[model samples]
Target: TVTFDITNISHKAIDIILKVVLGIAEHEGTEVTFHSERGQLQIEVKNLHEEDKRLIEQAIEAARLADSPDPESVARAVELLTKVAKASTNTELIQFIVKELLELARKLTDPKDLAKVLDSISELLTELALKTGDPTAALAAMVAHIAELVVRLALMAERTHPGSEIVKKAVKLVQEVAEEVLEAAQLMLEKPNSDEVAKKLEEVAKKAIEACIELQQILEAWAKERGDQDLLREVREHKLQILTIAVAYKAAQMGVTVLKHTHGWVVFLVILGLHKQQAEQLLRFVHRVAHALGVTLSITFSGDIVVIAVTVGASEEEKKEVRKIVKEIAKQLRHAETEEEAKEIVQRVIEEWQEEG
Candidate 1:
């Protein structure tokens, strides 16, 4: 495919864009090559790469620069270049592409007919998540927030704009910032150095927060300009949900970092297959015990599983007792029936443990 540069910036963008596209594909078990002509960006993809010419040519070039040729340096160079080839495998490159995507989408799409923009974004995001796993720390909770806010946003558009174009546009901003938050968290997970891990996460999180604030104010003022109080109210209220997501992401991103400060804590519970209802009830009891033990616990939503790591400076006796509570309650929930018991039987048994404490 060849994309002709209409505006002046396409030439400069082609290299990075192709790198990201190639990177996106390489992970999905496809190989890609990017070729460029003067004003056209030509892209190509192939399943098998049988070319050995470049490595030999690169080797020749390396030999000329050295009095004594060392294959080790060439191999090291190859290693580094390998990373550069699949650049989009990292959060850094993905974040840049998402930013550029937002810019081009913002400028290229018509405000009144936003379906094109929406479809483009949704499609690209599908590809993005396929290449890099979904970045939401808690997909269940994060998606619930998006689903709720988007519904409210559409309802407001129904009452005010009627065409819902504005809401569609608003949803794009929400999507952009949500990706930003995920990228921030992903960076921490892929962090290189200690200071960088802390600094960059804060940077991305703050940037996302401010971006939401900017859009929120713009829409709220637009709502006021349109002169509908209820529209303005919903518009104002809707932005806070995104802010909540960013803030929540910020704290959870630091969850791993924060755990290092705890001198000793036990991971007494680990399971990958439990209903959210059961797990949430189990969380209630564990949280209570953490309070009684005077320690904190970390809850990680890894893929579809739940892992709780207790962080404390408790005495050996308290530690053993806390372990008992975790295993005991988890056992109760194992065979525990749902719906009929008000879920309170589990609660009563937890209290029984507490009273005996």
Candidate 2:
């Protein structure tokens, strides 16, 4: 039995270590006893078969591999695996080996190196698909994996480099391709038994592969621009969120409309009660405000409330300007002693602004 103590390591690192150890043990036909105390993990390896001893040894070797901040080691590691896979007679064994390499890559603390590893893995999978006997299934699976990987990589980049132009462009690249896939899915739903469905799927699969390749190239270029070497930053959450918003933005840009969302807003509400006359004035003021702000306005009366909805397709600065104008109108309305006074106040403000312009 081999006992090892991993003391004062990060919970995340420890989690990765335990998973790797257990996986190796399972492959080696061994039992692993793992104990966690404070921030330490006490691990005992038992029942290792002689033929599987190397598996345990490799696990230990992998655990000792520290988090690499540069992309060179990761790129080189991926290159070696790529070569090993190419030279192998066992395709299944190559898949398993590549998967374990990816798992180890994910455990690295730096996100940039992880991204490079992902990029290289994508290339390896593409190569594997070409070499396999049944290319269709392998291509389909590889495309799907690459799509998810692109999303996660973009999400990580966004978190690490918020407001980064590179991240946004990378996300847009994937989103454009994903939008095509989604449209194909919709077509399949409409004609489930159509002969063209399979053809469309194949078409989409090819396009998806093309898009993934493009995204990998884009990421590689971005990595090269920042530093002459590879970099990594870790961000675990925001994967789905990044993909969701990217797709949504792309869909909306492609002329998809929705009834409920940020583009439609209820700017203000008027409680008419007995002061029904005030509703008309409020509606008129909002319409004028909307027109001046280059937006469309709608008013609907429900129960005792007059709801004012504004259709604003404006830049952030323009949106702020609209809000400021509305707030000024509200302030003037609040101070008026009567409905007529309120109307006059709003009229005077508009006139002053028009004159200034």
Candidate 3:
């Protein structure tokens, strides 16, 4: 039995401490009863597990530290809470505490400090996701949390680094968002019908859109100030990518048609004897052809083969046209001995097609 001589403490203070202690006891799987009399609160603990003692001690320590008006003490309190959360079997509680900590960490004013706290939250979520048997839910939560963090960081950068060299920092953050979206897209592709996964994907995509809009506004002002037309045009071009990725992600989630067509995209395997750089150039030429034909092209390298995935917006005719264009280009490249030959062939074919048209 543990009794607290809380006569000197206010009733509200006593209630708060009692709440913390009782909550910790439950979380630690200990049965505890409490009664107040004679200005003292006595806790009757029973069926107490071995770790119950440590939980109670930490609970008290947390309460004490939480009341301290110091940042270091507050951090220690968070550490204690984290230990308690880890020991508990309640995943809901763990997620709730994680979200609270994330919100608190995000409000930090210093950039370095904010980055540290955000990284800690990400690491914490990564750990929690590992502990779960089905990681889909945890992954979705982590992705959504990271998306919001990126948005906040972008907003902060827009305010502090707008129209300055510091905007480069904002660009770096936007690149991180782009990476996050790519991962999220892969997840959606793998588990297309998972409602929770799709929901989180939608939320994260929205946050990305918001952040990109903020970034575009900041970059636009910078371009205007420095007379950098190329920079401004480049931002304008990539802005479309930001929008398209979000829409594509959501469409995949909702089981949209045409996107499901395998012919909507094609993969070209780089044959042996072609230099990797030549394969890359070949795809760039294919990309330009697809763009001229109103199709989307994305390229990736897997092992020795460079893969080009193309998405068409129209019917079978358009698909055939794209396939023909790619086939002719591939034919020329396969015959080329070097990069110069490949480039010449690509230019010659495009010019011939233009003249014929």
Candidate 4:
């Protein structure tokens, strides 16, 4: 065996050997290594490098600027930052590494790549939005996104997957967010400037009301299966939450709409029974009944007949509960859906109340 010492041979010859080494030749057993001064052969697979001429030029510039106060420091800093940016490999890590780099255009200058990233993200979000097109997906995404924004951290993303867990989580999340947002709106009403504040407050209140109506729609859709405990529990909780916010906002917005818009009379329900001493009492009773069996009874006195109007959102099997409640209320009033039907039910219930009394 013959060994040759090729320590620091000419750069041109070394480049030729590199080309030969990487060539498609029968040199399978011929491995290359950088032998240390102590004769230890060191091998590395990954290499990070730049052209020596460029590095030498930078080094020369640094040396030439050494006599200047900040020139060398600035040059070295620029060189190192360039190297660091080039060496960065972790996509997510690099995101935070630059801190405000993405926010600044200089660091993220590839318009085409930026467009691509945006397009990809838009596609992903479109898929997620479609998750709302299917009732289950819509409810799940809606519940998850809104609940998360409200900081209802008790719920998990998995609940959005489907089935009972969703029902259980969704109900609580909707109720909590509604209450919090309602409170936020009320606080916004408390801000200075009476008229502007009232108008802003009404807008918030309207949003809160819209939220309640939307929640009811979700609960109804989820009620496709009766034995779904999650759905049932959610509906009960949400109904109470809706009424809780409704009772709070109706008073403020009535005056707000009346003063601000010519269509103020559209909300006559505001002070209809609101200021009476019985207002709180009625609300408590309304809330209690609303939380159970999904019936909201509206009582109106029309002439000689005491009208009992009951509204419910129930499926085929569950509707019997609403009917039962309605029938009982009708009997209490001298009125019904019809004068004849109301007369019989009311006469019967009034007699029962009288006998009980």
lDDT of each candidate versus the true structure: 0.43, 0.47, 0.50, 0.35
- CA deviation > 4 Å runs, candidate 2: 10-20, 23-31, 35-37, 47-115, 123-136, 140-357
Compose the digit string of candidate 4's lDDT tens values, residues 1-357.
112233333343333233322221222333344444443222221231343223323323322333233423433423432333343332332232122121221222222232232222223223333522332222223333333322222222223325454444444544444344333323322332345544544444444344445545554555554456665555544444444334434432332110110111011121222334344544454445344435555444323322223343445444454345345653454323444554455455445544222
Q: Using TM-score as the measure, what is the rank order of every candidate, best first?
A: 3, 1, 2, 4
Check candidate 3 and list the clashing pairs.
none
- State the local distance difference test value for candidate 1: 0.43
Most accurate candidate by lDDT: 3
Displacement of the residue 253 alpha carbon in candidate 3, Å: 7.3
| TM, every model | 0.32, 0.30, 0.41, 0.28
Query: What's model 1's lDDT at 186?
Result: 44
Best to worst by lDDT, what's the order?
Answer: 3, 2, 1, 4
At residue 357, give the lDDT of candidate 4: 22
Question: What's the distance in Å from true for residue 136, model 2?
Answer: 4.5
**Candidate 3 residue-wise lDDT, 1-357, digit = tens:** 544333343454454456556666766566667677866655667656557567656756655665454556555656776676656555454544454354344334434333444444444544554555343534444454544445454554444453545555555555555445444534543454467555655565555556656666766676787787776555544444343443333323333211111221232222223345554554454454344334355444433334344553346765565566566665665544455665566566566654322
In angstroms, the error of model 3 at 165 is 12
Candidate that beats the other on lDDT, 1 or 4, i.e. the better one: 1
lDDT of 2 by residue, 1-357 (tens): 877766555554454455556655756667778887765667787876543454334433433342343456555655555554554444444545555464545444433454555555556545554554332324333454645566565554554454556555655555455545444434433444455745765566545544544554454455566752323111111222222232222222222321111212223322223234544554454454344334454455533333343543446655565565556555555544454664466566566554322
